[PDB]
Write a protein that binds this ligand. Structure first.
Ligand SMILES: C=C(C)CCOP(=O)(O)OP(=O)(O)O
Ligand SMILES: C=C(C)CCOP(=O)(O)OP(=O)(O)O
Ligand SMILES: [Ca+2]
Ligand SMILES: [Ca+2]
Ligand SMILES: [Ca+2]
Ligand SMILES: [Ca+2]
Ligand SMILES: [Ca+2]
Ligand SMILES: [Ca+2]
Ligand SMILES: [Cl-]
Ligand SMILES: [Cl-]
Lengths: 353, 353
């Protein structure tokens, strides 16, 4: 598949970087191997595929192997975002496996090393994410230099600078929104635009278009396409994060409420509760972000569906997907791209995991 | 001066990036401003100046303003290394000022925000360092694209990939050396080669040569020059870190012993004590890395000078500086570069701060 072809290009790159760094010893090599295992250990490769479809939309052909490696840099950049997000959220596990800070704290304990095991695991996790990010940029630098016309390089760099600036801004805005207890739908929408719309949809698409041709019309259209679809993707995550079945999502039931995230769905519930039951709005305001029992969580989930926040979320998702498909249909891109991205937009809007 | 010209090029770049990101709101803007204040808030600009002299060594002229901005990327990359090092070391202050995690935890408290103030400060500090590093690479990408011949770009990228790979490896090796209690002089020398020789001397020099011309002879010579001088720089830090006067160094007396660093000087003291007093070696082995009173620290410092570790360190510094000046003198570079770098090598070898 195309995800597998992009994965193989990343697998070969990391193996080369790992061999070239072997002179730094077996401890650093074990760090690089742990990065390999984490990156190549599966995933949908959603962001590289968005770059692939952004390439097909305005290109006459299929891309060279080096351009697939450029797309794979989004996957390595995502490892950086995830590794540092696990430190930010203080998560113990990710997709069933221990987070980096726990793996390296356990390595510390297994060898009866001195000092705090948790300080070591946190330090090593910082450096692991840092490594993923410098190597992700090394891919962009190397592919640009050796495989792209100088015009394609300039367009690729502008997208590369935007995607990393916007994901960093989205992360900081998100932790500020939780700390300041920003209730508004606008605050959550602003974070979703940077963390989901830009970082997951719009900028990946534009990376592919930038690598293919100078199509400023298509770049601006994918901005509007990613704005609707990304917010639809985020709202889907918010519904799953509250009402998802753990056997289907793999996340604990009502994880967003347990973790105190400031989502659009939660923000809309507070607004709808102000309209229909002030005491229900008071329950939400004074419970979000606090240590909740499983009873409190189930109670808050019923209140969220009660005030109609779930129905409003599902209505928004349909509307944003419809307008995203409308934007995609009347677009000066190849019909093959229109069909591929319409498949993705439907899957992202209506999934259960 | 040249440090001021490089600083001004960085000041203008960050102001441009900050204006271009203003649409993300006042909270992220406050983060960018804090990065400005930290980077531009002083410094010797040692690594950019090494890139400057590496440029003069093989160039017929003085560099364009954009090439000075490329040199300033080393200063922004250093902000990343310092911000994440403060999290790794759990330092409360740096050069008199609060570290990032303390500034942002205090911002959290000042606004009566919710959650853990320290978790927020740690999260914000991670993102601050991340920002400095993506923007440092954005400088290298932008200057390469718009100011360098494609041959100069390829040489610059190879140095850029090495310096960030080696500083990351040096950091990980350093925390592994402290956790595993690696006593040997070789372990400390290995860390010093990556953290000091490569990251501070060799790679900065090579960045300047790479931006000027294809002089593989000079690049290999600066590798040998930075190997002697960097280890001399590190040994100077180790002596200051144990025997430095706080009024002169600005660090607390015997900071390296208080912080439990695995330095060459400490490693040599354990080896010399094995030779002259096993019980003194036992005192060092069982005290390094532990919580020490000020009496213990002063006792350990006397033991270090007793076994002659300080004299051995000062002898090594003179020898490495002599061979570094010998390497510099018989080098196919401009005589102006030879005089400038000889000034730096003397200052780095014999300083008190
Ligand atoms: C891409 C970024 C910035 C983080 C990825 O993790 P998520 O965004 O899915 O995780 P939470 O913030 O929901 O915990
Ligand atoms: C460049 C790097 C990796 C860190 C800079 O700080 P120092 O190296 O001077 O700090 P310590 O490790 O001695 O605490
Ligand atoms: Ca998070
Ligand atoms: Ca998370
Ligand atoms: Ca999320
Ligand atoms: Ca340190
Ligand atoms: Ca330090
Ligand atoms: Ca040091
Ligand atoms: Cl909406
Ligand atoms: Cl030596």
């Amino acid at each position: 598949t195309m995800a597998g072809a992009i994965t193989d290009q990343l697998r070969r790159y990391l193996h080369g970087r790992r061999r070239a760094a072997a002179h730094m010893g077996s401890d650093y090599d074990g760090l690089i191997a742990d990065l390999e295992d984490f990156v190549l250990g599966g995933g949908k490769r959603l962001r590289p595929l968005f770059a692939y479809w952004g390439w097909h939309a305005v290109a006459s052909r299929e891309p060279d192997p080096d351009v697939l490696l450029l797309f794979s840099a989004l996957e390595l950049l995502h490892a950086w975002a995830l590794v540092h997000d696990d430190l930010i959220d203080r998560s113990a596990t990710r997709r069933g496996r221990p987070t980096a800070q726990l793996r390296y704290a356990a390595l510390h304990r297994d060898r009866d090393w001195r000092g705090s095991p948790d300080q070591f695991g946190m330090s090593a996790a910082i450096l692991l994410g840092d490594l993923a990010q410098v190597w992700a940029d090394d891919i962009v630098s190397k592919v640009c230099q050796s495989a792209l016309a100088p015009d394609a390089q300039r367009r690729v760099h502008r997208v590369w600078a935007d995607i990393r600036n916007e994901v960093l801004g989205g992360q900081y805005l998100d932790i500020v929104a939780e700390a300041s207890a920003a209730e508004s739908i606008e605050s959550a929408m602003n974070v979703a635009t940077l963390k989901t719309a830009c970082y997951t949809v719009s900028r990946p698409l534009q990376l592919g278009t930038a690598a293919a041709a100078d199509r400023s019309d298509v770049a601006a259209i994918f901005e509007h396409f990613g704005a609707d679809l990304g917010v639809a993707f985020q709202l889907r995550d918010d519904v799953l994060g509250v009402f998802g079945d753990p056997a289907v999502t793999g996340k604990p039931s009502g994880d967003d409420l347990k973790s105190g995230k400031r989502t659009v769905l939660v923000a809309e519930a507070v607004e709808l509760a102000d309209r229909s039951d002030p005491l229900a709005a008071k329950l939400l305001r004074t419970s979000i972000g606090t240590r909740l029992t499983d009873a409190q969580v189930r109670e808050l989930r019923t209140v969220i569906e009660a005030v109609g926040a779930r129905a409003a979320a599902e209505s928004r998702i349909a509307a944003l997907t419809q307008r995203a498909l409308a934007t995609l249909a009347s677009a000066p891109i190849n019909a093959t791209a229109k069909a591929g991205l319409s498949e993705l937009a439907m899957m992202a809007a209506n999934r259960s995991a």
